[PDB]
Design a protein around this ligand. Structure first.
Ligand SMILES: Nc1ncnc2c1ncn2[C@@H]1O[C@H](COP(=O)(O)OP(=O)(O)NP(=O)(O)O)[C@@H](O)[C@H]1O
Ligand SMILES: [Mg+2]
Length: 298
């Protein structure tokens, strides 16, 4: 579109020109709040054609929102970690929504992996996945990035089942208020149920809001994808958590890992651990584990 030339110069390194990209509109991978993700293809700097996923960003109408995203996207282009999903780049078609090109992750998301009846995950298998998420997130936090929507579904699995943390950089402070709104009848899987008590009262997010969300993610892993706070009337959730009640310890979840989960859900954000400490504590648990067993589905 007709954007500030100075901006496009400023953000050059993120941008893939639209004529280097093919989005397969007939090959939709999936749909969600922030946009649609299609199968796609793009042309390298080295001139080869690489297949990947492409997400049309449906929540960026304003030009202020476009340029803000372009600049975050530049910082995200710099993110390099084994447990973080890479940003290939962003494409602006002459008229339309910004598109985000992402590496295709061929084993899907962590939630569907764990929910699969074709699979028989052990306790230790699931804790390991959690460990890989805490490294993804430790890096993001070190790089001054706040996810805002950490959950099992936004953790992808690559060819060799390496977990990549993903869909950070989409939700924003205050502007995406409605994404974290209450009372929507079909409420079992809304982001409200993963997000920290104080973020629900301001729609401002920090790394410590991400530590809450991680705890909730770690519960999913060990329930093999149960909805959190399932039977809590959605309008009663903030009051419930203020009472100091929390998700119950999963059947086969070790006491120590539940103690970790509890630390993540501390109501004082400052009392919650850092992801650096979480990688350490969770790693220690995996090695300390005496025996192992299968976990069942809810
Ligand atoms: N890089 C990728 N490679 C493969 N699949 C992807 C990629 N990024 C997103 N997806 C999938 O695209 C679909 C839509 O993503 P999204 O709109 O974020 O849905 P979601 O609500 O976050 N997860 P879900 O529980 O599947 O609805 C999901 O099925 C994702 O697993
Ligand atoms: Mg996602």
């Amino acid at each position: 579109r007709d954007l500030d030339s100075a901006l496009l110069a400023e953000v050059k390194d993120v941008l893939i020109p639209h004529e280097r990209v093919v989005t397969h509109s007939d090959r939709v991978i999936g749909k969600g709040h922030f946009g649609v993700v299609y199968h796609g293809e793009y042309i390298d700097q080295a001139q080869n054609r690489i297949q990947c996923a492409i997400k049309s960003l449906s929540r960026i109408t304003e030009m202020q929102q476009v340029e803000a995203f372009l600049r975050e996207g530049l910082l995200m282009r710099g993110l390099n970690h084994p447990n973080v999903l890479a940003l290939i780049g962003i494409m602006l078609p002459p008229e339309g929504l910004p598109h985000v090109l992402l590496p295709y992750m061929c084993h899907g998301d962590l939630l569907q992996f764990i929910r699969s009846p074709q699979r028989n995950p052990t306790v230790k298998d699931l804790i390991s996945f959690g460990l890989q998420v805490a490294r993804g997130m430790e890096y993001l936090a070190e790089q001054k990035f706040v996810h805002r929507d950490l959950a099992a579904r936004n953790c992808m699995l690559d060819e060799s089942f390496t977990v990549k943390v993903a869909d950070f950089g989409l939700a924003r402070d205050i502007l995406d208020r409605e994404y974290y709104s209450v009372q929507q009848h079909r409420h079992a899987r809304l982001p409200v149920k993963w997000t920290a008590l104080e973020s629900l009262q301001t729609y401002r997010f920090t790394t410590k809001s991400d530590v809450w969300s991680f705890g909730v993610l770690l519960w999913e892993l060990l329930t093999r994808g149960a909805p959190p706070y399932r039977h809590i009337d959605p309008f009663d959730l903030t009051h419930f958590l203020a009472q100091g009640r929390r998700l119950p310890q999963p059947e086969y979840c070790p006491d120590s890992l539940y103690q970790v989960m509890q630390q993540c859900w501390e109501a004082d954000p400052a009392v919650r651990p850092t992801f650096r400490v979480l990688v350490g504590e969770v790693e220690q648990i995996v090695s300390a584990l005496l025996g192992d067993h299968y976990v069942q589905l809810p």
